[PDB]
Amino acid sequence: RSFCAYWRMLLCPDSCSIEGGCPEVCTNTCPL
């Protein structure tokens, strides 16, 4: 599993506002 597991919460402190939708790593649907 990529960093998308841990970095999900790491780069997404409710950053969904500034990132428009949500941070790409906040979207824990990251491909393998």
Short mmCIF file of C-alpha atoms in Angstrom, two decimals:
data_model
loop_
_atom_site.label_atom_id
_atom_site.label_comp_id
_atom_site.label_asym_id
_atom_site.label_seq_id
_atom_site.Cartn_x
_atom_site.Cartn_y
_atom_site.Cartn_z
CA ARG A 1 0.00 0.00 0.00
CA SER A 2 1.20 3.47 -0.93
CA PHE A 3 1.46 6.44 1.42
CA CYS A 4 -2.22 7.09 0.64
CA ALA A 5 -3.01 5.16 3.84
CA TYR A 6 -1.16 7.37 6.33
CA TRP A 7 -0.77 10.52 4.23
CA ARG A 8 -4.54 10.57 3.80
CA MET A 9 -4.84 12.26 7.20
CA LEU A 10 -1.41 13.86 6.87
CA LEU A 11 -2.14 16.14 3.90
CA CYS A 12 -5.85 16.46 4.66
CA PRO A 13 -6.49 18.54 7.83
CA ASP A 14 -9.90 19.48 6.37
CA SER A 15 -7.93 20.91 3.44
CA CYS A 16 -10.87 19.96 1.21
CA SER A 17 -11.87 23.63 1.35
CA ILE A 18 -8.63 25.05 -0.08
CA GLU A 19 -8.17 22.14 -2.50
CA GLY A 20 -11.62 22.80 -3.93
CA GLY A 21 -12.91 19.27 -3.61
CA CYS A 22 -10.43 17.33 -1.50
CA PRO A 23 -6.65 16.65 -1.43
CA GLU A 24 -5.69 13.84 -3.79
CA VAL A 25 -4.30 11.76 -0.92
CA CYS A 26 -7.42 12.47 1.13
CA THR A 27 -9.28 10.49 -1.49
CA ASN A 28 -8.33 7.06 -0.12
CA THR A 29 -9.23 5.34 -3.37
CA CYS A 30 -5.63 5.59 -4.55
CA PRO A 31 -4.67 2.93 -7.16
CA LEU A 32 -1.98 0.37 -6.37
#
